[PDB]
Amino acid sequence: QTLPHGHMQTLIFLDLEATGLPSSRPEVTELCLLAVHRRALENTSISQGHPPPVPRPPRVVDKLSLCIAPGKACSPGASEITGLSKAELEVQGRQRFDDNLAILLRAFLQRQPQPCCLVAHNGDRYDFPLLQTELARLSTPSPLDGTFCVDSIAALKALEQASRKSYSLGSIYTRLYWQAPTDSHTAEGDVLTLLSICQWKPQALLQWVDEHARPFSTVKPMYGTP
DNA sequence: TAG
Ligand SMILES: [Mg+2]
Ligand SMILES: [Mg+2]
Ligand code: NA
């Protein structure tokens, strides 16, 4: 382009469940990362047919799915759709978002060939600023420091405009594949759904991602800590 | 406009 940050070598599909929506000062209850090398995406076969079948996930993938005890209760709305509550997370012995979690994420990211780019649906307004806020509370250094990120809503908008309607995760998936997504509002279900829409046009997605990746350190926290 |  020249590419502003070089080729993204690893795409990290990311999904968070949390206790509520942005004005509630929400906290994370579940986290899922799906790390895919760009080779896996460029090896995805072209989406043919109307509709095309849902693309097959790459064989080679690193996956991390974690349930996390938040510091405050879930809104009733959040619990009904995620199937999670703070109390039941604690009955199941889930720990808080803590320094160890940060050390876990860092080691997971370091397994990936660099640089890594986080991909989340509406990430620019939800997942990235939320995650930035969770990590901010920790005295521990951010494990996301040399990482990049993109919002898949912008990606799919550009990809479909390259070919009114909704750009919610489920809407896009149903429009592309004429099927309902499964396990919605679980971190891993919605991450796998996200993987599928991004595999719709894998080459165009990588190109767009390389051009719009931005440092996660420029992400503004969703809300302030004490 | 999209837990
Ligand atoms: Mg989400
Ligand atoms: Mg979800
Ligand atoms: Na393509």
Author numbering: 4 to 166, 174 to 236
Please, what does the article write about this entry?
Three prime repair exonuclease 1 (TREX1) is a member of the DEDDh family of exonucleases and accounts for most of the 3′–5′ exonuclease activity in mammalian cells. Anchored in the plasma membrane of the endoplasmic reticulum (ER) through the C-terminal domain, TREX1 degrades a variety of substrates to prevent initiation of autoimmunity. TREX1 is, in fact, unique in the DEDDh family for the activity of dsDNA degradation, which enables its participation in preventing autoimmune responses and in restricting retrotransposons. In this work, we solved 4 X-ray structures of TREX1 with representative DNA substrates to delineate the molecular details of the multifaceted catalytic properties of TREX1.
In the TREX1-dI-ssDNA structure, the hypoxanthine base was designed to locate in the penultimate position at the 3′-end of dI-ssDNA as the products generated by Endo V. The last nucleotide at the 3′-end is stacked by Leu24 and Ile84. Each active site contained 2 Mg2+, MgA and MgB. Therefore, the chemical modification into a hypoxanthine base at the penultimate position of the 3′-end did not affect the binding mode of TREX1 with ssDNA and its active site structure. Nuclease activity assays showed that the exonuclease activity of TREX1 in the crystallization conditions of TREX1-dI-ssDNA, TREX1-dI-T-dsDNA, and TREX1-Y-structural dsDNA was inhibited, and the nucleic acid substrate in these structures was thus intact.
